[PDB]
Amino acid sequence: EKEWQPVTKLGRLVKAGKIKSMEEIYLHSLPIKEYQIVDYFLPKLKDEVMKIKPVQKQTRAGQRTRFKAIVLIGDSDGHVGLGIKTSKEVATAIRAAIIIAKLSVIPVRRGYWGANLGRPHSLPVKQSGKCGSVTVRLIPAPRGTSLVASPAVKRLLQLAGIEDAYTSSSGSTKTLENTLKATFAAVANTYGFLTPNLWKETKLIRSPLEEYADTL
Template identity: 40%
Template sequence: MGMHSDSRHTGREGVGRGGEGKDLEGWVPRTKVGVYVVNKQITTLEQVFEQGYRVREPEIVKMLLPDLKSEVVHVGVVQKQTDAGELTRFSAIVACGDEHGWFGIGRGKAAQMRLAIDKATRDAMLNIIPVKLGCGSWECRCNVQHSVPFKVVGKGGSVKIEIIPGPRGLGLVAGANITMMLRLAGIRDAWTRTFGSTSTMSSTALAVYNALRNTYSIG
């Protein structure tokens, strides 16, 4: 398959910033890490990962990444037949990132679309991971963190994606939703190749997430 240049997108919608101070008013941490963050014993998300802690409260991410942004990747309708009739629920997939090396994907279901998006946004924060940025393009070698440091591959369901380092100025050669997710992670220039049923956004989002996670697990 050739380099991916599809411009199709599904259900994209801006959610806005997740780190507004008003969202943290009245937050009482329920975990040890949350207490450390409130008491300024932990001041960066890097410290959380370096010390082997898990993020169990989205407020931790909101406080440590005040510039975090969220985007809706996909919203679908799930219908289920019950004794009382047909039950309709919304299913949302949301991506979050600070555009400087942090990225997360989350899912949420609810009877109302906004609630499903809110659940997915919180889930994305709990799934946030560090992404290693760099310049692995043989055409560039500029030492600026604008791409991935080397080729990474990720799989999700039937979907496989390859993210290949690109030179500065190339942009992102990818479909609209994949481009949006890579930008949230901080990647500005890269080629991508996709295989499988990329119209299944849950699998595509997971494939992107796993590829970005491999920037650290491999390198």
């Protein structure tokens, strides 16, 4: 509600504003642990809850039910994350789940199908992910083609900011949590594929943590 007290060095430094933008934090692959960093260098984030699962768990005293909520966030311009949390009430679960999602947010590479004419629109390469008896495959597509996918996996792509793609899925796709996690892993690994246009050597620099001393 009011001024937040940084508990980690990465948190105190950003509040001062010494670090320009999130991208460098990604460049140095640093762990984020406070959701105040993310929403400071990424405002205008929309969230949607897919569904809540009722689980008639355990017996001997009846069943003590817990509820599991799945939420995902994005800005439709290259940042997306997904988190899941369960609790004893839907309101408590949803709030805690959004926090977990904000922590998870990652960037997504976007490229061209054929020839480049500004404003990349699709994936650079084709890539796939697997999260247990379910695989999802995404391949590039030309302009004009919309997103071709099931409603669940389709919704994620707007939040990531992709315009053109073909999709394919195998295995038991009725497990919504497993399906969403596989798509998340697939879109994530696009920055791991070493394309021809990245062979050029880059120079190593010191991380922001080491450049300057912090404030008590």
